[PDB]
Amino acid sequence: KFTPPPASLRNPLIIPEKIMMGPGPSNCSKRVLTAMTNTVLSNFHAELFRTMDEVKDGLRYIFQTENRATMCVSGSAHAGMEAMLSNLLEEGDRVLIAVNGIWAERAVEMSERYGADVRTIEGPPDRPFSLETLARAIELHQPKCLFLTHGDSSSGLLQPLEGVGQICHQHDCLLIVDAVASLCGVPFYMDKWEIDAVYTGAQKVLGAPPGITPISISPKALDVIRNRRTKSKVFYWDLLLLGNYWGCYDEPKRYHHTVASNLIFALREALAQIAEEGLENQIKRRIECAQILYEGLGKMGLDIFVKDPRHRLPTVTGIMIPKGVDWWKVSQYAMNNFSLEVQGGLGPTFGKAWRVGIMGECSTVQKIQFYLYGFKESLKATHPDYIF
Amino acid sequence: KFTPPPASLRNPLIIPEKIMMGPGPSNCSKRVLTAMTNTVLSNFHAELFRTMDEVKDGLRYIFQTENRATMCVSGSAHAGMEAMLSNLLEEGDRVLIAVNGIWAERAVEMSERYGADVRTIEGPPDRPFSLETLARAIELHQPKCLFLTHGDSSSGLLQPLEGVGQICHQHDCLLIVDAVASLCGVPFYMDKWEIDAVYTGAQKVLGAPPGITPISISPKALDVIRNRRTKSKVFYWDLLLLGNYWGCYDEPKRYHHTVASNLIFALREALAQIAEEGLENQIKRRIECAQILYEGLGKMGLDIFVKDPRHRLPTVTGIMIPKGVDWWKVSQYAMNNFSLEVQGGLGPTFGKAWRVGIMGECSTVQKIQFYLYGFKESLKATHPDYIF
Ligand SMILES: *Cc1c(COP(=O)(O)O)cnc(C)c1O
Ligand SMILES: *Cc1c(COP(=O)(O)O)cnc(C)c1O
């Protein structure tokens, strides 16, 4: 006999529809969602490998790379960060991290745990790092790797990347980039920009379900991994082993770990959607949507965390809480009345701003208009003395 | 302008239905599959936490534990092994691993990478370790942890666990058990058996989609983690942080990483299914199915890798390839003609046996009978000189 089953599992599962307009996760399309519904395949099934290959092709397209070592880590976007750090750094290696958001702080935490010698350079959360600042810091610290956040979803800040790789390469340094919140939202060119290691998030701009993380490393980064003195700490995302199963190398595929079939089907479909519309058009649609958002916020008298428009990530915008305002009072009204997701702050924006994402299925003019409408109605009903 | 999209993404996604009767992944039910279809929820949405709690309850039920630190790692089963090892071991700590299958070999590899002092004890792949052998090894090596595979999917071997925890505890040793292939297939009692750390697989007996790993640690194992000298190497599965977000502790939940909502909804529904039928009944159904399998294989003149029925894991059976026989020709015929998954060998059974799973939605008498039929017809059509 067994201690009895829980009563909480007697009710049916009910998950409401929501208008997911925070900085992640985004709304997935019906097509992407129903893809998860296919048969879970065995590790060496031909149709799994074929889907995996289509994903790598899709990934090379969105990263704009020809990297053969393009694959996925079986984890959320944190695991992509974890993988770059555990594979590219040995104990004692110097890593330079430019820190002006929460993701870089996570990267510091991870590099420490992996026993790297962590060199940081601080900056304001609302202004990027200059080529000069970075060049200087690289010269000084002579790091094996530089980590940069491309689009920062804790602030709404976009980091220019042109020229950075070149400098890194001048100094025997790998450039690793976190493109989780930026990819498919603004131009990105892994190869043109000399980037050695990049990852995105499924559940951000792509509108894919979370849990699997697209990744790409350059032949240079790859050769650095092949030549390490010691095994990397984590078998699960050892990129030699994982790349082998993904068919990235001139080697027969060996069982490594069971991949999330269903998440792969969905990622594939999300990649097809962007391939069908085209990168340029998606980026342009998201840029327009940002503009409509900025205008509408202006008319309400609301300020934007990243003040200079030149510096703004289109896909995530911090809306500053005005003085008298309870942010959570607005957000809950939004959800209860409009099923609208009005997300709060994180890191730099914690307690200071709400965060609006333009990602996945809400990257339309109509969606942005509805957001502005529901946000306004929500602030209005909730703080009747606010003046627009 | 962008280098053009891949043509491979222009075709619709087409995944065939298959009768998934290898040792993983299993067929998920329609209910479980369509649950993935729900809205991807934000990390602090109430309905996510509610579903997470139901999962914990379902987990305590199938593990038969009252552990508060019952939760999921965001990875496939390997990540659960990774988590146990990185959390419970510090650099230099002695871990004892009893090695007679591939999973223990993986645990050796991981423990090495995490800088443990790995002690091993070998055994035949087709016979379990005795209490005497294990007690002796524990006494000798004085390990911080003992790792055991419960059900071995590479062999079809079932390891008796009664008495092992007691011995470990007499010696200040933690018992960590891999129940990936055994859970819900045979009786298991985490608490009664004095086990401190356990994980299963979603895509094995449970009939849930792969990519998320149920886990439970004892208050003892928990206190060990709270008292470590150094941070664990992997932030992503740091169990103090992950258990916090899962609400395992007397602490307010902090953002750790984005969990796979869709995989959680599915797991929840797989847990509800087994809760509705009950553990005892599911275990008895799988035990009968194995008997039917054994009988049918006997009639065909076919040998079973684990010879003594006393030692067999009901959910995975190794079918020895007869002398003249091309295992893969049989398997492909089975798929092409019956959509039947006849899996090959792994580790101990590599090139020696096929592997039949009794897991997920194929744990029925009718499914076993069809397997026997399809298998036989496939051997027959493919090797006309084989004698039954
Ligand atoms: C299949 C299996 C694993 C592997 O899990 P993945 O989901 O493939 O990472 C680990 N342990 C046992 C006992 C298994 O059967
Ligand atoms: C949201 C985000 C992450 C976190 O990813 P998870 O999928 O939550 O693990 C990492 N980097 C950036 C830039 C992000 O926006």
Swiss-Prot record, chains A, B:
GO terms for molecular function: alanine-glyoxylate transaminase activity; kynurenine-glyoxylate transaminase activity; L-serine-pyruvate transaminase activity; pyridoxal phosphate binding. Its EC number is 2.6.1.63, 2.6.1.44. It catalyses: L-kynurenine + glyoxylate = kynurenate + glycine + H2O; 3-hydroxy-L-kynurenine + glyoxylate = xanthurenate + glycine + H2O; 3-hydroxy-L-kynurenine + pyruvate = xanthurenate + L-alanine + H2O; glyoxylate + L-alanine = glycine + pyruvate. Optimum pH is 7.8. This is 3-hydroxykynurenine transaminase. It is found in: Peroxisome. The keyword Transferase applies. The modification N6-(pyridoxal phosphate)lysine is found at K204. It holds the Pfam family Aminotran_5. Expressed in gut and ovaries. Pathway: Amino-acid degradation; L-kynurenine degradation; kynurenate from L-kynurenine: step 1/2. GO terms for biological process: glycine biosynthetic process, by transamination of glyoxylate; glyoxylate catabolic process; L-kynurenine catabolic process. Keywords: Aminotransferase, Peroxisome, Pyridoxal phosphate, Transferase. The gene is HKT. Its main location: other. Substrate binds at S153, R355. Homodimer. Catalyzes the pyridoxal 5'-phosphate-dependent transamination of both 3-hydroxykynurenine and L-kynurenine to xanthurenic acid and kynurenic acid, respectively, preferentially using the alpha-ketoacid glyoxylate as the amino group acceptor. Although glyoxylate is the preferred amino group acceptor, transamination of 3-hydroxykynurenine also works with pyruvate as the amino acceptor in vitro. Involved in the detoxification of cytotoxic metabolite 3-hydroxykynurenine generated by the hydroxylation of L-kynurenine, an intermediate in the tryptophan catabolism pathway. Optimum temperature is 60 degrees Celsius. At physiological temperatures (30 degrees Celsius), retains 60-65% of its activity. One of its GO terms (cellular component) is peroxisome. Pyridoxal 5'-phosphate binds at S76, A77, H78, S153, Q203, Y255, T258. PROSITE patterns: AA_TRANSFER_CLASS_5. Residues 42-43 are annotated as: Binds to and confers specificity for 3-hydroxykynurenine. The keyword Ribonucleoprotein does not apply. Its cofactor is pyridoxal 5'-phosphate.
